[model samples]
Target: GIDPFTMGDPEGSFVDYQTTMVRTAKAIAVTVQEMVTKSNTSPEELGPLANQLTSDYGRLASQAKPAAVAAENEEIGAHIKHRVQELGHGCSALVTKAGALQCSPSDVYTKKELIECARRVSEKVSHVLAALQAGNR
Candidate 1:
């Protein structure tokens, strides 16, 4: 109990870091939605950039999903590592683009652009996960 190498209070229960990461991911999504609503960024304007980001997020999220399932079965360490990596990769891309869009509204393309970017990425991730889950049956 006295080991200095340990972080956090050893006596306290472990917190769900996965949930925290997911919450942050959800916040990133919400911010993107707000930008779309306010800025009127359109999918047509997003063009190649939206397609690229969607592809990237989908690839990362789908790959990390196995780790999510492992975590559900109480494999905490592996689950946390994979899920965080997965969520971080997707969230980081979205946030980075959103930040760029925020800094240059004139160059942002369109509101539907931002909305479509978010929608495409989110839908791909969701669809992959849903298919993965269904395959378990």
Candidate 2:
């Protein structure tokens, strides 16, 4: 229940916070890549992943305070905020795409489309990770 983002000491908290964010973003990227590599992914699998992505985005949004602190460090706040927005948007798109796929006949959803969505989400996640790395340094 510790909100690392709002720990009141940016200097000390950011190291742990950024490190955790980097690991989380990398894990998400890996998950998306694995899903894309599969020849086929069922709606069942995709739906759960989509739900998890939504939760991940929500958690990231909850940590928005870190970006505010980044401004005090090196004016990285705007960049961090931008990346967070991009990641949130990508996750939202994936959620909508997956919901549609789940609602329709399995044949209606193409593997290519799913892969594209996953790739977009991964890109956004990587972007955030990169921004965090830059700010942390």
Candidate 3:
């Protein structure tokens, strides 16, 4: 007979970790969508949104590290950690550019760059989600 609550099983913990990672990544994608949509808006107008995205991205990265370290499967943990790092770096760049846009009117970064950043973040998030989905199969 199978235990209803396999609380002590390492496999169970890994599954829970993967589920949390997927949910966090999805949330990041939603924020990226909002950031991309507002990319065309004035920097002054987009400042708060960009700041929020940066914060969200940082939080996800921080959360992913612990989850990845806790994974029972070493390979899967590495993949998830790698994706998290990629997304985190991308978000950091975006934050720097957005800060520049907000503080100065100079043409340092255009709408194209903003959109590209969002695209990259979305891609990374998708990758993490895909990896988790496959592992569940």
Candidate 4:
């Protein structure tokens, strides 16, 4: 007999979490692409930003692997998805700003934007972490 609902069964509920993570990562990639196009910069032009984005994606995606093997509820999954996206958005903004900075050395506004984006990302990540922790209990 197969129980329709299983707690912590990675195959079912966790699948949703994994799927959402991948989707958010892809979206972040799109945003990066836009930033690259707008600034007319190549990856080599902003190597640090490009590398950081890639690393962040890999780290976040790794989180999905464990979720796939653990049993989690909808609420938990939602929190995780939200956290992943929050992190992704923050990283995207930072990377974009960094790329822009590389493109134009005298662009003070771009530097300010990057700093502001980083601050916002920090605050958002804290909130998401709180929510995820709460969901765990």
Question: lDDT of each model, Cα atoms only?
Answer: 0.46, 0.65, 0.70, 0.56
Q: What is the alpha-carbon lDDT of model 1 when measured against the actual structure?
A: 0.46
Write candidate 4's Cα lDDT for 1-137 as tens digits: 56647434444554555555455455445545444443443434455555656575656656745663453565654565566566776776677777767777577787667656655654554544444444353
> Which model scores highest in TM-score?
3
Colliding residue pairs in candidate 4 = 8-71, 9-71
Task: Locate the minimum summed-lDDT window of 10 residues in model 4.
Answer: 35-44
Ten consecutive residues with minimal summed lDDT in candidate 2?
Answer: 34-43
Rank order (by TM-score, best first) = 3, 2, 4, 1
Worst window of 10 by summed lDDT in candidate 3: 4-13
Taking the tens digit of each residue's C-alpha lDDT, what string does model 2 give over 28-113?
77666655553255565667666766766776655556654744555455566677777777767666766666665355455556
- Which prediction has more favorable lDDT, 3 or 4? 3
Best by lDDT: 3
Write the number of the candidate with greater TM-score, choosing between 3 and 4.
Answer: 3
Superposing every Cα of model 2 onto the true structure, what RMSD results? 5.3
For every model shown, what is its TM-score relative to the native structure?
0.39, 0.73, 0.78, 0.54
Candidate 1 residue-wise lDDT, 10-126, digit = tens? 212122333333443454454445545555543334334444444444544543544454343344434444554555555556555655665566774533345566665464344
